[PDB]
Write an enzyme that holds these catalytic residues in place. Sequence first.
Site, PDB file in Angstrom:
ATOM      1  N   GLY A  46      -0.772   2.874  -2.917  1.00 62.12           N
ATOM      2  CA  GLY A  46       0.947   2.937  -2.837  1.00 62.12           C
ATOM      3  C   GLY A  46       0.908   2.955  -3.886  1.00 62.12           C
ATOM      4  N   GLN A  51       9.602   2.068  -7.500  1.00 62.50           N
ATOM      5  CA  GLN A  51       8.706   1.547  -8.517  1.00 62.50           C
ATOM      6  C   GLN A  51       8.580   2.671 -10.210  1.00 62.50           C
ATOM      7  OE1 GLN A  51       5.057   0.737  -5.619  1.00 62.50           O
ATOM      8  NE2 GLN A  51       4.646  -0.810  -7.513  1.00 62.50           N
ATOM      9  N   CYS A  89       0.207  -5.479  -6.182  1.00 62.13           N
ATOM     10  CA  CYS A  89       1.620  -4.624  -6.630  1.00 62.13           C
ATOM     11  C   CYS A  89       1.196  -4.474  -8.120  1.00 62.13           C
ATOM     12  CB  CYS A  89       2.955  -5.337  -6.128  1.00 62.13           C
ATOM     13  SG  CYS A  89       4.720  -5.125  -6.212  1.00 62.13           S
ATOM     14  N   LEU A  90       1.272  -3.085  -8.161  1.00 68.00           N
ATOM     15  CA  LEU A  90       1.330  -2.514  -9.575  1.00 68.00           C
ATOM     16  C   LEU A  90       3.153  -3.104 -10.545  1.00 68.00           C
ATOM     17  CD1 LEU A  90       0.933   1.082  -9.084  1.00 68.00           C
ATOM     18  CD2 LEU A  90      -0.858  -0.271  -9.839  1.00 68.00           C
ATOM     19  N   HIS A 131       4.040  -2.523   2.943  1.00 67.25           N
ATOM     20  CA  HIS A 131       4.668  -2.697   1.421  1.00 67.25           C
ATOM     21  C   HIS A 131       5.846  -1.813   1.374  1.00 67.25           C
ATOM     22  CE1 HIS A 131       2.795  -4.290  -1.855  1.00 67.25           C
ATOM     23  NE2 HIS A 131       3.360  -3.751  -2.349  1.00 67.25           N
ATOM     24  N   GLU A 132       5.039  -0.690   1.225  1.00 64.80           N
ATOM     25  CA  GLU A 132       5.767   0.526   0.953  1.00 64.80           C
ATOM     26  C   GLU A 132       7.315   0.382   1.142  1.00 64.80           C
ATOM     27  OE1 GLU A 132       4.782   0.227  -2.360  1.00 64.80           O
ATOM     28  OE2 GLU A 132       3.261   0.643  -2.123  1.00 64.80           O
ATOM     29  N   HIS A 135       9.898  -2.075  -0.591  1.00 67.60           N
ATOM     30  CA  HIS A 135      10.412  -1.511  -1.578  1.00 67.60           C
ATOM     31  C   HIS A 135      11.603  -0.532  -1.124  1.00 67.60           C
ATOM     32  CE1 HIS A 135       7.075  -3.041  -4.978  1.00 67.60           C
ATOM     33  NE2 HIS A 135       6.141  -2.244  -3.966  1.00 67.60           N
TER      34      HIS A 135
END
Length: 159
Positions: A46, A51, A89-90, A131-132, A135
């Site tokens: 994702g 991000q 998380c990236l 999760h996304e 953000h």
Amino acid sequence: MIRDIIRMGDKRLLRVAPQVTNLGSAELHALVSDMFETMGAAHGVGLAAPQIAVDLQLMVFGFAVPLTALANAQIEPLSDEMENGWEGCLSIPGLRAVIPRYRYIRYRGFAPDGSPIEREAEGFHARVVQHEYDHLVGRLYPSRIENFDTFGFDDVLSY
Ligand SMILES: O=C(O)C[C@@H](Cc1ccccc1)C(=O)SCC(=O)c1ccccc1
Ligand code: NI
Ligand code: NI
């Protein structure tokens, strides 16, 4: 074009993103294409627009989870049942923790061409979307950890 992923600590991950108002446009299609490429190069499942420092309600996801681009997402739990599971998380590279999420949800919004999306999801599918979504409201997963024993570097965690 692969975009830089910003890291935790950047203020731009703490913003509440505005809506996408260019559904069907060439500009949005190119941003989405960039997001899939970016997510792909980082080996994510994702990626949310904040991000890559783009302040919009837009995410991409999928991997088993159908590849999806979702604008203006709205989520609603379909029960109160929580489930714990691993998240990374990236924007927080090398780390992971156990986070509780709704096991069952419905999400809605729009595909980048303007057509509506509305799905029920459960488990990992649902987790990724939650999760996304976080953000888009300036929230990262550390603020949801309940058991700090589970938080740690991927290569070392044993829990
Ligand atoms: O960084 C994001 O917002 C993307 C992220 C999404 C995510 C993974 C797992 C649970 C919830 C949300 C990642 O892809 S993390 C990087 C990764 O390689 C990975 C981590 C856990 C499972 C599968 C892949
Ligand atoms: Ni390219
Ligand atoms: Ni159950």
